[PDB]
Design a protein around this ligand. Structure first.
Ligand SMILES: CC(=O)Nc1nnc(S(N)(=O)=O)s1
Ligand SMILES: [Zn+2]
Length: 222
């Protein structure tokens, strides 16, 4: 069923669109979130085993996304291996740091062998052109549609070397807003210039951030 970020269709009504999106309105563990208060703790280190792959770049109407047809690219956290399925973008950011919205956020979405979802997040500050995204921005379908990119894409360039993160449990920020999703929001910020963010918005047709949800019972670990 149709949903979006504006119109009579907007995030605050997602739960009533159908019975099967109801968690969007009724869940207590929803993403995204404003990360204000945190607990300093000893989080397991991330190990990135990303490498180049043959990807396609899809406009599904709601974001620009890079689909990984094969496993290949993994993340090991806490002796668990998670397989990168796809990554995609929000302009502006869904998650916030101390009330601060960022001009873009990237969501790297995974499953482990138990099919447990993990989202590793990168927040972009305004700054110089992102040279490592230009390859994806250049083939960006500006309407709904899908192109396989000729030259291999390496996602290791999209993650910093400093891999400190905020950790919390949450949900998909798009319908059906399924809960039980591990969130790891990296502290080290990448950058995008203004054209890049505007083009994206132009392509997808709107700013595509779900608004922040209450933490309720949850604690964010830094
Ligand atoms: C199959 C799949 O991954 N669907 C998603 N829906 N929302 C997502 S997000 N913005 O939380 O990372 S991913
Ligand atoms: Zn997302």
């Amino acid at each position: 069923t149709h949903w979006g970020y504006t119109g009579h269709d907007s995030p605050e009504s997602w739960g009533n669109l159908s019975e099967e999106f109801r968690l969007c309105s009724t869940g207590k563990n929803q993403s995204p979130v404003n990360i204000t208060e945190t607990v300093s703790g000893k989080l397991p280190a991330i190990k990135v085993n990303y490498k180049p792959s043959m990807v396609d770049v899809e406009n599904n109407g709601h974001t620009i996304q890079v689909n990984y047809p094969e496993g290949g690219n993994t993340l090991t956290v806490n002796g668990r291996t998670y397989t990168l399925k796809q990554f995609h973008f929000h302009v502006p950011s869904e998650n916030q740091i101390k009330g601060r919205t960022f001009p873009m956020e990237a969501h790297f979405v995974h499953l482990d062998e138990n099919k447990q979802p993990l989202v590793l997040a990168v927040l972009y500050e305004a700054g110089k052109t992102n040279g490592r995204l230009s390859s994806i921005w250049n083939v960006m379908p500006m309407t709904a549609g899908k192109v396989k990119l000729n030259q291999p894409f390496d996602a290791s360039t999209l993650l910093p070397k400093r891999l400190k993160y905020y950790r919390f449990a949450g949900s998909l920020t798009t319908p059906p807003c399924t809960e039980g999703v591990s969130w790891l929001v990296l502290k080290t910020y990448d950058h995008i210039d203004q054209a890049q963010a505007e083009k994206f918005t132009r392509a997808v047709g709107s700013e595509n951030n779900r608004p922040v949800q209450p933490l309720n019972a949850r604690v964010v670990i830094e």
